[PDB]
Symmetry: C3
């Protein structure tokens, strides 16, 4: 559960970084 | 429930990331 | 519970910023 929320929210956010560069 | 947390942390994280730029 | 998850995941992401930059 913890890893799911941490990895899910965190992975989507790093994706924001990649999209904006 | 969990999605609720995922959404609030996600919006705050994108804001701190931009603020730290 | 909520603050713990937000703060814990959020602090990890800030680590990504310092780790990348």
């Amino acid at each position: 559960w913890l890893g799911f929320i941490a990895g899910l929210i965190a992975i989507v956010l790093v994706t924001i970084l990649l999209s904006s560069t």
